[PDB]
Design an enzyme around this catalytic site. Structure first.
Site, PDB file in Angstrom:
ATOM      1  N   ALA A 169     -70.679  51.291 122.599  1.00 39.24           N
ATOM      2  CA  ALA A 169     -69.689  50.240 122.438  1.00 39.24           C
ATOM      3  C   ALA A 169     -70.429  48.972 122.025  1.00 39.24           C
ATOM      4  O   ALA A 169     -71.458  48.627 122.597  1.00 39.24           O
ATOM      5  CB  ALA A 169     -68.915  50.023 123.722  1.00 39.24           C
ATOM      6  N   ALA A 179     -75.960  46.164 121.366  1.00 34.35           N
ATOM      7  CA  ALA A 179     -75.034  47.003 122.111  1.00 34.35           C
ATOM      8  C   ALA A 179     -74.460  46.231 123.288  1.00 34.35           C
ATOM      9  O   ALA A 179     -75.188  45.537 123.994  1.00 34.35           O
ATOM     10  CB  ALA A 179     -75.743  48.248 122.609  1.00 34.35           C
ATOM     11  N   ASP A 180     -73.153  46.346 123.489  1.00 33.97           N
ATOM     12  CA  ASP A 180     -72.541  45.856 124.712  1.00 33.97           C
ATOM     13  C   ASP A 180     -72.739  46.897 125.804  1.00 33.97           C
ATOM     14  O   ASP A 180     -72.963  46.564 126.966  1.00 33.97           O
ATOM     15  CB  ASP A 180     -71.049  45.602 124.511  1.00 33.97           C
ATOM     16  N   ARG A 181     -72.654  48.165 125.412  1.00 32.49           N
ATOM     17  CA  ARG A 181     -72.797  49.262 126.352  1.00 32.49           C
ATOM     18  C   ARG A 181     -73.107  50.581 125.656  1.00 32.49           C
ATOM     19  O   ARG A 181     -72.347  51.038 124.806  1.00 32.49           O
ATOM     20  CB  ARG A 181     -71.518  49.424 127.164  1.00 32.49           C
TER      21      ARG A 181
END
Lengths: 356, 353
Positions: free
Chosen positions: A256, A246-248
Site C-alpha cells: 500500500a 511505502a505506507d505499508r
C-alpha cells in the site's frame, strides 16, 4: 543536508511544512506540548518524523530538569508525556511504538539496584538520541543498499541511471535523508544519477510541493511531470528504474502506498524497467498476509475537487478519493529495499524476522 | 442534449466556456467579427465547434443580407470572411477546410447557369446548416455504433457496463453530442450504462472542468477521479471499457491524443479491458503512416506548475509538459470508432480511402 528535524542536546528545531515550498523556515520546540501542537497542525509530516519530534521534545524537557523529583514522579512524568504524545496524530504506529520503548527503558531504568533520578533522566534522553541516529542511519542504509542493487540490475558496468519516483519519501517524510529519495541521493553522491523524474502525485501534490523542493535544494538534476505523463516519460525520456516508498508492505510484499503507485508499477512492467519499493522494516506489517486485507482509506471528495480553497471540478460530480492503492508483489520487479537489505517479495517475511 | 452551440436560422448563441463550470452563460452572436472575438477569447473550444461557429456567424449575416451587391460581391464577401475566420485560431484546420469548400460551394452555384443573388445566398446559408447537421449526425453515429460494438464485446449477455474516459470529447469539444462522450451518452440512452468514470486530465483539467460538467448536466451516473487513480479504478471499481477521443489518428491507427491516453491504454491492457479510440474521419490523417511521424507539442511549464494563477510546484523545478502522447495501435484493443463504425487498426487505411 536537508533537515526537517534539527536536534542537539537541549535544542530541538523543526522545519514548518505548512510554509513549504514557498518558504523554508524552522520553529523552535521547547516543550512536549509545543510538539503536540505542531504535529497536530501538520507542521511535522511523516510517522517516523512525528515520533522522533515528540520523543526529542520530551528529551528537551528532561534535559532542562523537567519531571520529578523522585523516580516514581519522574517515570510518571515520562509516561504521561509519552502517552499524551501518542494522542497527537494516532494515524500511525511509530509514536506509540517509540513511546513503549522509552517507557520500558525508563521502567527498565527505574527498577535496578541503586536506581536514581539522574540515571533515569540521562538514559531516557540517550535512548531517544539513539532512536534518532538509528533512524537516520537506517535511512542512509536504505539509500545505499538500494542504490547498489539498482545499479547492479540496470547499469552494472558503470553508466548512469534515470530514476522516476512518486509522492514524497525524502527528508520531508522522515527523520532525514529519506527512503526512495534516499536512494536517489545515494545515486547522486556516487555520481551515477543521470536524472530524477518526480510526479505531481495528485490530489495532495506532495511530489510537486515537497519532492520538487528537496530535489531543487540538493541541486539534483530533476524534472517534474504530471501523473499522466509517467508512461510518456518511460517511453521517451529514458527512464531506467522506478523507486517509490511505502505506507505499508504486508507479509507477501503487497505494498500500500500513495495512490498511483499501482499504476506506476503497471507502466514500468510494460516498459520492462525495474520497480523498487523502499521501506524500513517498521513499515512492514507481517500480520497481514496479503494486500486484500488492507482497508483503503478514502478521503473527502472536496480534497480532490478543490485546490487552494477554490473548487476546480464541476459542481455536483461524484468523486472517488482513495488515499492509497495496493501494488501486487509480482509487479515489484526491482525488489523491496529495507535497512536490512534488498529482498524479493517472497523472501521479505523470513528475512525481516531472522536477520540483523 | 447539452448544446455548446445553439443555432436556428437567423440566430446563433454560444456557451461561454470561460465561465464553465460554475456558470452557464449563452452569448448571442450577430456577426462574423463577434464570432472571431469569441474564438480568440477562447469562449469556443474544439476544432469542429470553432469551424461551425464561424461558418454559422457568416450564415446569420447572410440571413441578415450582409453581402452586396450583385453576386460577384457576395462570393467576394463570403471568401473574405472565411479567410478572416481562419486567422482566429489556425491551430486547428477544421476552419480552413470548412472555408475552402464553403467557398467552392459559393463558387459552383455562382457559376450555375442563370445564377442569382438570392439563390446563392440561401444556398450558402443552407450549406452551413447542413455542415452542422452532418457533424451532429456523425457524432451520434460514433456514439451509437461505438456503444453497440462495446456492448457486444464486453456484455453480450446483457448487463450494464462501466466506461472510463479521459479529457473532454463531448458537446464542449464538438458541435454536439461528442465522440467518446457520445458513446457514453448512447450507452446511457440504452439503459446499459452502469457508471462513467472521468479523469481530471492534468494539467488543463478538461476532465474535471468540462467532462464532469457534461455528465452532471445530462444526469449520467458518473464519478471524477485523478489521472493517477485510473489503475485503481480498473481493479476495484469494475471498469469494463475505456473510450478516448483523438487529436490525430494516422494510417496504421497510431493515435495522438491528450497526454495520459497512452498510459490509459497500457493500464487497460493490464486489466484485460478493451481500449477504444473515438475519432471522426477528419481526425484521421492518412498522410502519415505511423506515430513516429508525429511531432509532440510541449506547452509552457507554468501551465503545469500553476493552477488558478497560483504556483503549486516548488520554485526552481524543471518541467516537462508535452500536450499529447501517442498510443501504439496494438493497444487499441477495442477498435477505432469513426462515424462509419468500428475498425481494427489494420482496417482503417482501406476503410478511409
Amino acid at each position: 543536508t536537508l533537515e526537517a528535524i534539527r536536534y542537539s542536546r537541549g535544542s530541538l528545531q523543526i522545519l514548518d511544512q505548512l510554509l513549504l515550498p514557498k518558504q523554508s523556515r524552522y520553529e523552535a520546540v521547547g516543550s512536549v506540548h509545543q510538539a503536540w501542537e505542531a504535529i497536530r497542525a501538520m507542521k511535522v509530516r511523516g510517522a517516523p518524523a512525528i515520533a522522533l519530534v515528540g520523543c526529542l521534545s520530551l528529551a528537551v524537557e528532561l534535559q532542562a530538569g523537567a519531571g520529578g523529583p523522585g523516580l516514581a514522579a519522574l517515570v510518571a512524568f515520562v509516561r504521561d508525556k509519552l502517552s499524551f504524545l501518542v494522542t497527537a496524530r494516532p494515524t500511525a504506529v511509530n509514536m506509540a511504538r517509540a513511546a513503549r520503548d522509552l517507557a520500558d527503558v525508563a521502567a527498565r531504568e527505574a527498577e535496578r539496584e541503586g536506581a536514581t533520578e539522574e540515571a533515569v533522566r540521562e538514559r531516557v534522553i540517550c535512548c531517544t538520541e539513539d532512536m534518532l541516529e538509528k533512524d537516520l542511519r537506517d535511512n542512509r542504509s536504505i539509500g545505499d543498499l538500494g542504490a547498489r542493487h539498482l545499479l547492479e540490475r540496470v547499469a552494472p558496468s558503470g553508466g548512469k541511471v534515470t530514476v522516476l519516483t512518486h509522492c514524497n519519501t525524502g527528508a520531508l517524510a522522515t527523520a532525514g535523508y529519506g527512503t526512495a529519495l534516499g536512494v536517489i541521493r545515494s545515486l547522486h553522491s556516487l555520481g551515477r544519477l543521470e536524472h530524477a523524474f518526480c510526479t505531481e502525485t495528485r490530489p495532495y501534490n506532495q511530489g510537486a510541493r515537497l519532492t520538487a523542493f528537496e530535489l531543487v535544494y540538493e541541486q539534483i538534476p530533476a524534472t517534474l511531470i504530471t501523473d499522466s505523463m509517467v508512461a510518456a516519460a518511460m517511453a521517451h525520456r529514458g527512464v531506467s528504474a522506478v523507486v517509490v516508498g511505502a505506507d505499508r508492505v504486508v507479509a507477501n510484499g503487497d505494498t500500500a502506498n500513495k495512490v498511483g503507485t499501482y499504476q506506476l508499477a503497471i507502466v514500468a512492467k510494460h516498459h520492462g524497467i525495474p520497480f523498487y519499493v523502499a521501506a524500513p522494516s517498521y513499515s512492514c506489517d507481517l500480520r497481514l498476509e496479503t494486500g486484500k486485507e488492507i482497508i483503503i482509506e478514502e478521503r473527502p471528495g472536496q480534497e480532490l475537487t478543490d485546490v487552494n480553497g477554490v473548487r476546480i471540478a464541476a459542481p455536483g460530480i461524484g468523486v472517488w478519493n482513495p488515499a492509497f492503492d495496493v501494488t501486487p508483489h509480482d509487479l515489484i520487479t526491482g525488489g523491496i529495499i529495507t535497512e536490512l537489505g534488498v529482498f524479493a517479495p517472497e523472501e521479505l517475511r523470513t528475512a525481516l524476522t531472522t536477520t540483523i
